[PDB]
Structure formats: C-alpha cells, structure tokens
Write a protein that binds this ligand. Structure first.
Ligand SMILES: CCC(CC)O[C@@H]1C=C(C(=O)O)C[C@H](n2cc(-c3ccccc3)nn2)[C@H]1NC(C)=O
Ligand SMILES: *[C@@H]1O[C@H](CO)[C@@H](O)[C@H](O)[C@H]1NC(C)=O
Ligand SMILES: *[C@@H]1O[C@H](CO)[C@@H](O)[C@H](O)[C@H]1NC(C)=O
Ligand SMILES: [Ca+2]
Length: 394
C-alpha cells in the first residue's frame, strides 16, 4: 500500500460508455433502500464506490416524509460498491454529514463530512474510518463542500469549501490535507463570482474544477490550483451555457472571466462538471433550459480558452422526457487501467418525487455512471424507471 501519484495527464476521450446503473428507487419499491440525494463516485486503487447522503429513512417508509428544505442532524454520508443500490444492509457508514466530499490516498479512504447548526457548522475529517481533524466555519453561514469526489496526489488531498450566502457574494477556500490533517488552506478572491459544489479532477499534477454559480451566472466557474494552492479562477470560456436554469445557446454570449446571467436564471443552479481536453472541453448539462430534465455531454472546440460556439460532438444519455439532477466528475487511477493518462468519468443523479412530482411525499434519486473511451460511442436514455406514486404516497 503506497500513495497514488495521480500526476498523469487526463485522457483524451471521444465518447462516454455507460458503466453502472443502480436502479435504487425501483429496487426500493419493495426492498430496504435509503432515501438519498447526490450519489457521487470516488475510486480507490482497487475499487470504485458510490457515496451518497441520506437522512436515515427508507423508501416507502413514513420517515421519508420530506416536509421542509433544511439541513438535518439525521443526515449521514454512506457508501456502497459501484452499481449497488444504496440499501440498508450493504451501506457502509463514512460520516455524519449534510454536505460532504470523499476520495482515496492510495492508502486509505478520506471522507469529509459537515454537520452542525447553520451558523456554527464544522467539518469532521475521517481518514481510514477515523476522526483525524476538524474544519470550523469561518463565516458562520452554512459551511458546505463539493458533494463529489475530492482529489489526492502524491499523498496530499485537496477540496474546495464555501462559507457565506447561497444567493450573494460568499467566501471560497481551497484546503490541503495529508493523512487527514489539514496542512494548508487558501482563500480564493472572486468578487462578483459564486463558487458552489465543485466537480474536481486531477490533470497533470494540477487540480481542475468546474463548479456551480448560484448567484448571477448561468455559466460555470472554473478553478485551477497546484500543490502550493496557487490558483487561477474564472468561468468556462465557452459561449455555450451549461448551468440550469439558462437561456438557449443563441441567446448567450460567453466570458472567460465574469458571470453572465439575467433573463430569469439568477439565484439558482445545478451541480455539474467539465473535463479539459487540451484547449477544448467536454461539458455536461441538462437538456431542458429551465428544469432538471434530460442529460447530454458536449465537446466544445477550444471551449476552455475562448468563447467558442462550435460543438463538434453531442451525446444524449437521458432524453428530455425524464428527470435528471446533479452531475459530478471523477477519475480512474492508473494502477487499474495500466494506461499512462487518467480516465475521466462522470456520474448522473436522477431525482424522483418532489418538487416535480407532487403526488409523492418524498424525494430521492438513482444514478448512472459513464466513463470516457478512445472511440465515439452512441447515446440512449437510461432513465430511473420507478413507477410513481409509491404505496406510502397513498
Ligand atoms: C445551501 C447551499 C447548497 C447549494 C446551493 O444548496 C443545496 C441546494 C440543492 C439543490 O440545488 O437542490 C439541495 C442541497 N440539499 C441536499 C439535500 C438533502 C440531501 C440528502 C438527503 C436529504 C436532503 N437538501 N438540500 C442543498 N445543500 C445543502 C447543504 O443544503
Ligand atoms: C407527512 O407529513 C404531513 C404533514 O405533517 C402529514 O399530513 C402526512 O400524513 C405525513 N405522511 C406520512 C406518510 O407520514
Ligand atoms: C490530449 O489532447 C491534447 C490536444 O492537443 C494534447 O495537447 C494532449 O497532449 C493530449 N493528452 C494525452 C495524454 O494524449
Ligand atoms: Ca446559476
């Protein structure tokens, strides 16, 4: 057991092939399956796992009653093998958490889980199962993190946190840890911009993040930083907006440096992802411009360095007749592909129930996972499949 370098370049991919589909809500119609959100994936040197947040209720149980949009003391971070349903008997407990990130050194699992009150929350760092350090809130306004896999290189692990208003200017910080101990941190000066729920991946020894602007941007913030936490910050250059809500593409002018919004798209967003491809970028986005429906991945030529509108490839993995949700990025290590680049992958969450389906008293989601390959692959629509409403809704 050795630290994983993860200093290799990210692979160039011409398509994404489906990897897993957990069918959790379908199974949860009769089986014992957690009500969950945001099923993100992280990979160790021997295995990939689906992490998720749950409040301890099971599908078709009265405790799934969704009631209010708060943050709960009941909410926890758990994990299952990639492709498994988030069920009661396979789930492995990682952390108390209503916001979380997790990744793997190469030696041990690292899990960061945030709990506590909105005005004085704190993060507990779990390393190999154990509380090893704490990060306190520095702005006392809902301390929160990625909701997807963090990044470990050369025995050091990095993640991004936000403290401040969700619809106004906030504070954004990069953290560096070693064996679960925070060894450095850096605040990202980003006036006018809004960083929230970043999807990060390693790329040639640097960390590259595609995030969500919940304030004034229908384009996605971009954050890149090195092992000293020296950074550059801005927005995805491409003249294609990839947040939700947004406007149609022809009604949009891109920007590498500033948030572009208005037209009724402000004060919301969705977690999403992108992958730098030399000068171009693979970027995911919902098919619908106003709601979380459908999903597609766009290869935007030169879209990482200029405001290009040239889409050279588009693959739909979920049609606009089906509910999508969050998306996030992760990478497969080389101790397992025997390649010399890092394979880019993404997971897709598919939300069922409230708010879009109001005859159900609950909200949960299932997932599909895709990885990039050398050749082009066709798309299809791998929808959630659960038939709603459920029995508890009667
Ligand atoms: C408050 C800042 C963030 C980013 C806008 O806001 C997020 C809005 C999200 C959205 O965009 O829909 C929903 C997120 N969230 C997740 C959950 C939940 C998770 C597991 C079990 C049950 C509920 N509840 N809310 C919420 N992050 C939290 C910690 O509040
Ligand atoms: C869910 O909560 C509402 C409001 O408290 C209540 O009217 C309803 O009966 C509850 N449903 C279940 C299944 O507990
Ligand atoms: C991926 O493609 C870009 C496009 O020019 C190239 O610069 C880069 O070297 C490629 N990376 C690998 C690992 O092949
Ligand atoms: Ca937005």
């Amino acid at each position: 057991p050795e630290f994983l370098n993860n200093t290799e370049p990210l692979c160039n991919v011409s398509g994404f092939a489906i990897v897993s589909k957990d069918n959790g809500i379908r199974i949860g119609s009769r089986g014992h399956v957690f009500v969950i959100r945001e099923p993100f994936v992280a990979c160790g040197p021997t295995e990939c796992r689906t992490f998720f947040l749950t409040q301890g209720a099971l599908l078709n149980d009265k405790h799934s009653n969704n009631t209010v949009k708060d943050r709960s003391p009941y909410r926890a971070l758990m994990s299952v093998p990639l492709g498994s349903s988030p069920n009661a008997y396979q789930a492995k407990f990682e952390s108390v958490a209503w916001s979380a990130t997790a990744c793997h050194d190469g030696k041990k699992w690292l899990a960061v889980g945030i709990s506590g009150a909105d005005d004085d929350a704190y993060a507990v760092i779990h390393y190999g199962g154990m509380p090893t350090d704490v990060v306190r809130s520095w702005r006392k306004q809902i301390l929160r993190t990625q909701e997807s896999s963090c990044v470990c290189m050369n025995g050091n692990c990095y993640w991004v946190m936000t403290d401040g208003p969700a619809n106004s200017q906030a504070s954004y910080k990069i953290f560096k840890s070693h064996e679960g101990m925070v060894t450095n941190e850096r605040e990202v000066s980003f006036q006018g911009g809004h960083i929230e729920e970043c999807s990060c991946y390693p790329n040639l020894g640097k960390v590259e993040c595609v995030c969500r602007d919940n304030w004034n941007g229908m384009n996605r913030p971009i954050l890149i930083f090195d092992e000293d936490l020296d950074y550059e910050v801005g927005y995805l250059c491409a003249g294609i907006p990839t947040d939700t809500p947004r406007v149609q593409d022809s009604s949009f002018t891109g920007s590498c440096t500033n948030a572009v919004g208005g037209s009724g798209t402000n004060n919301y967003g969705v977690k999403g992802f992108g992958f730098r491809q030399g000068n171009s970028v693979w970027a995911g986005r919902t098919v619908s411009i106003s709601s979380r429906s459908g999903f597609e991945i766009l290869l935007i030529e030169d879209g990482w360095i200029r405001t290009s509108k040239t889409i050279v490839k588009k693959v739909e993995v979920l049609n606009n007749k089906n509910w999508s949700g969050y998306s996030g990025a992760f990478t497969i290590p080389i101790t397992m592909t025997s390649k010399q680049c890092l394979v880019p992958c993404f997971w897709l969450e598919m939300i069922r129930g409230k708010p879009e389906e109001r005859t159900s008293i609950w909200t949960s989601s299932s997932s599909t996972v895709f990885c990039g390959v050398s050749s082009e692959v066709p798309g299809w629509s791998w929808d959630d499949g659960a038939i709603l409403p459920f029995d508890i809704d009667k």
